[PDB]
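can u pls check wat happens w/ protoporphyrin IX containing FE
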Amino acid sequence: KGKLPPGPTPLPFIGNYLQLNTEQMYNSLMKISERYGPVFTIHLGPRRVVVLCGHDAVREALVDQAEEFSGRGEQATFDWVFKGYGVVFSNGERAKQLRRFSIATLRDFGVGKRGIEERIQEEAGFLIDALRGTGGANIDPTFFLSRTVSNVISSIVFGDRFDYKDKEFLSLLRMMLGIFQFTSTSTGQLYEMFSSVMKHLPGPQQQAFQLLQGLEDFIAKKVEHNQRTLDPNSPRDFIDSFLIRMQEEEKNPNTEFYLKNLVMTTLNLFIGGTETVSTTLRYGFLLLMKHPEVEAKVHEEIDRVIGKNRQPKFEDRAKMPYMEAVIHEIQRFGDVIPMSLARRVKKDTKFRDFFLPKGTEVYPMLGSVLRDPSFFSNPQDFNPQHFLNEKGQFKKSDAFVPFSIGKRNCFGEGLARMELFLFFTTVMQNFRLKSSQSPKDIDVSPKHVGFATIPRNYTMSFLPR
Ligand code: HEM
Ligand SMILES: CN1CCC[C@H]1c1cccnc1
């Protein structure tokens, strides 16, 4: 029965609203940690949350006490559509079934294997083609990168990749993009505290709902399409494998394989498989143009190990320590999902002499692990040396946790690291990156930080080398 972690006294309903700047949630919670310690209690409106800061607090909970911290908490904006259904927002039995099935089915369509390495190499080549065809003109790379990324997971879950022509495609991409931005604003973070009121009020949360509805309707139309052209012995994509598994479980009335879980799971993958990698690429190029010395070492190393002729491949990894360090440092620096997705204690839990009642939400401050001064000698700088030893060979970090850790850690990690290596490598093989402004003027502080870290709007050009 010990005590909850210390933290500032909340008000009825508003919680710790007075100590929170919803524009800068992460900076807010970190200011509070400086006063209360690395483990503290915050009230996000009426949501009682335990916040974990620094590598040690986060590894201790999510790894050393893995089972106890394995429950899924809420993200309220996403909840509006998912409603506890689908792999990401589910718990207990639902969670174990959808994750085990999702991981396996991803692996059946080539994730972690030559299959998807081919699909990514191919789709990369299509990206090179498009950036050439701009002929060095000053463009917004946003939808160039995200079309390419989205087409990879799209081929896995929908079968065939989207034609760049498709107007529905861009529409979906705008939708995904506007949701990531919304959830990263003051208002999206205010919604995390006050959703039981705000869901019924007018404002930018109404528009973010319409985008979620947009994505749900598109997935439900693709499912429909898949069902009535289905072939039970030869699955065409993820949706088919879940349709089939649905059919096998018409006997079991306690099954988790029904329509709503298929829709929401496919939506999770589509969304998860698109926006984070895409935001990482986009920040990544921005960082590279700001650090032209880094771009030159990368260029130097691409030329010696790969040269201009062949397609980069995943194994090149092993022989490119400086590129792996660059991509590691883009992820670390980007901090794209700075507060993870919320966890929940699965039962009454003891954790460092605090007591956590069953159901308490947990915030793993992944951003604080990526910036932990005990693991990286210059947290606020972009410096690939963070992941290099004395001998310029790749150096692992225990604080490299952009995908989180523990039992509900990101299972798209393997796909992502593959897409990131290949897309970054192939793009810089063919282009030098040319900024709109001089390196000293490039602003890499974020536009929005909340659920995600969003880079500022920018333009650039892609010049042949
Ligand atoms: C830059 C790439 C990515 C980053 C930084 C990232 C980040 C994260 C984080 C921080 C979590 C929460 C894990 C936890 O609760 O401990 C998560 C979960 C998840 N991710 Fe990713 N992710 C990425 C890519 C992907 C991709 C490509 C997919 C699609 C295949 C994907 C699908 C998912 C799913 C389905 C979950 C829910 C895990 C569960 O509840 O069991 N992610 N991700
Ligand atoms: C933000 N994401 C990256 C991995 C999980 C994914 C996500 C988050 C919220 C809803 N669906 C998918």
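The longest strand covers residues 39-44.
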